Write a protein that binds this ligand. Sequence first.
Ligand SMILES: Nc1ncnc2c1ncn2[C@@H]1O[C@H](COP(=O)(O)OP(=O)(O)O)[C@@H](O)[C@H]1O
Length: 259
Amino acid sequence: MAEYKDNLLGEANSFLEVLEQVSHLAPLDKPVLIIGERGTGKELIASRLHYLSSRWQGPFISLNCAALNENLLDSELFGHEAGAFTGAQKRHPGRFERADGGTLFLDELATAPMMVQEKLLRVIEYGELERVGGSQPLQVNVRLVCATNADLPAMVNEGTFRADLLDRLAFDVVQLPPLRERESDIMLMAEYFAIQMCREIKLPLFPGFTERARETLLNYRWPGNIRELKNVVERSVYRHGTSDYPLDDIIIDPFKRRP
DNA sequence: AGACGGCTGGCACGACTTTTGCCAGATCAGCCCTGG
Ligand SMILES: Nc1ncnc2c1ncn2[C@@H]1O[C@H](COP(=O)(O)OP(=O)(O)O)[C@@H](O)[C@H]1O
């Protein structure tokens, strides 16, 4: 293991609590699930669970759920023996078999085709899956790790998620807290971000914030979570222009009329 | 002398031949290293 200084700021305790939980599960072997609001740093957390385990070496496949072809996934997952079907001429490695020793990270697990929810089924349990047209079975020691943003309990009843394919993906959820909740955290990430954008309009230095911005932001409920401060804060800098004086007003929304 | 019929050959269009272009891989057996 190591440290891997990853740009993931904000004390707020809620962050400390999830990090403690996330850090504690780093040496595990059981699949975890991250439930959080869209754009709450879920990506960071996925990636936390690997570069912190006892295999910071293994591979690390992205595995989008809606990124799959679907018609031809029966070989995009396990993958195949060269010559299994017309056209085949070289063995191809399934994502799972890619990811042996490493860990898979299904982005947006909620949005997934029904067919893909069943196929996966046995790749998770035990570790038996043979390539399409394959002559023998094998093993896979790829720890599973995925995170969503849409709630899954409702989905299980709704039938969009197999009632049975739920006990088996999640052994633990790391459920991140909402932006508004952290409220300490505001200020800080703001400021880190300002200077962020400051590097890149070629400018010397960011004068700061007026009280007027203190109020604007804090009053604002942030329903876009981490990006709201970024999209909102970085956008303000463009409007701010000259660095001689500190900015006081930042618009909440790009949408609607300007006069 | 002018029109009609015959002849040949160029060109076109399907039905059909033929000619060129691929590029390993996995699997099995003997020998060397090591455990019993
Ligand atoms: N704790 C944090 N502090 C500062 N910025 C963050 C934090 N977590 C995420 N971000 C930034 O905000 C964006 C939110 O998107 P992302 O992290 O992908 O969330 P999700 O994966 O849930 O969609 C990211 O691009 C990331 O750079």
